Amino acid sequence: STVPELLARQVTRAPDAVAVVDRDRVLTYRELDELAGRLSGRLIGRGVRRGDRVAVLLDRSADLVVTLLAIWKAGAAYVPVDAGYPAPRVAFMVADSGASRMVCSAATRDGVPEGIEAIVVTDEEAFEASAAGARPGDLAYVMYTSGIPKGVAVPHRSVAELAGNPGWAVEPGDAVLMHAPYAFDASLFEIWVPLVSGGRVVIAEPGPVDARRLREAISSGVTRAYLTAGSFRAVAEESPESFAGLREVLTGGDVVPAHAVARVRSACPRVRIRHLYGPTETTVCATWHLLEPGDEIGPVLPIGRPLPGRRAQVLDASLRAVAPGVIGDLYLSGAGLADGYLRRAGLTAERFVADPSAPGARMYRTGDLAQWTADGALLFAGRAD
Amino acid sequence: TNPFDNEDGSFLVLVNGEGQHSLWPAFAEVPDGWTGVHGPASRQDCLGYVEQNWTDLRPKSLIS
């Protein structure tokens, strides 16, 4: 599948439902589709062809969501660039990624590198609305991860498996706060999961989301919010009551201590707390651990169990599966794998290796250590290095 | 030491039906659906074969 295909079901089912809320701007599902179609038409009219990469340099806004969807409708993959990156980093990402065109706003126009076509999203053009259509094997985005940043090339099929996963449990009444950089793959949960579920994406006001802005967002109707491990830890120790009123808070990335989760649960008994784990190479997250309302976290916070449609293996130095309670190398397989690393076939072939448990399939070597619990959860045991 | 990172290890290059290449430690049985096409050789030698011979990451199914 593809996220546009999943998105199309929600546009058909409830076209007048709210899809994106920006400060004074509210876009319904039908309105979002029409805007993306017009910008896609512009891209097709400029010579954009299937598989092309289009860079994106925008601040979070309704225009951002439209741009990513428009690139997909034109058959191309978006290369997200954070407007706050230094110019040499921006220049490197554009050049390494093979993007020949770059969508920007008036405010970001000066960040487009020289020699790269700038496409100003608020400019009109004559081209009719037209869409080539996303396809599951075509590329969906290239996200850079670091010494030097490398581009992880992710196909539509992997993005849709993540975004459409039933485990997210996002429903039409949900409202998800969007504040993560769209250059990072936490934005795939904040943008695409609600849109494939019928919910609304709520663009956070400019600046970092602090506890106060979180409380205010909750008062305005936000029901789910992802925070980086650092942000979750800060708010949990200083103002854990700020999560009150959320249906679910999510966190992951860097290490999260069990103590932080226990503090939140004590202040907010009804809040679901979800720990996410995974690399960009496996689309946002491959495993997760969910603390239900009223439940108390143990002394250790697991990275949890594989998402539906995924598999994990813990292998020793001989590539043999270990028994529970044995620390080994963590490998991720099943749904959500990237195609590989752009321009780096050797790196792809050493990180994305043959999977002995699935014929012809690959697994991603996380470089992390883990052990199984007796009942099939995973505990982090540090990086192999 | 993880076997896939050992620069002094002996390695194979494998290929699946989609044309994707994989490094593989030569001591381990080759999984089903994968064919050995190079090695045993040094890690760098195997990486060089891949860089030389894997010219399109795109799955061979995608191309046709």
Residue numbers in the entry:
A (entry chain A): 9 to 154, 158 to 396
B (entry chain D): 2 to 65
Show passages lifted from the paper:
The MbtH-like domain Tcp13 also exhibits the anticipated fold, containing a 3-stranded antiparallel β-sheet and an α-helix adjoining the centre of the sheet.
Comparison of the A1ANC2 pocket with the A1tei/ANC1 Hpg pocket revealed that the amino acid substitutions contribute both to prevent Hpg binding and opening the pocket to accept proteinogenic amino acids instead of Hpg. The L295V mutation then opens a cavity that allows the binding of proteinogenic amino acids with a 109° angle at the β carbon. These two key substitutions (H237Y and L295V) enabled binding of new substrates and potentiated the binding pocket for subsequent refinement and partition of substrate binding mode. Activity of ANC2int is consistent with this being an intermediate pocket, showing reduced activity that is improved through natural selection, and supports Van-type GPAs as being older than Pek-type GPAs.
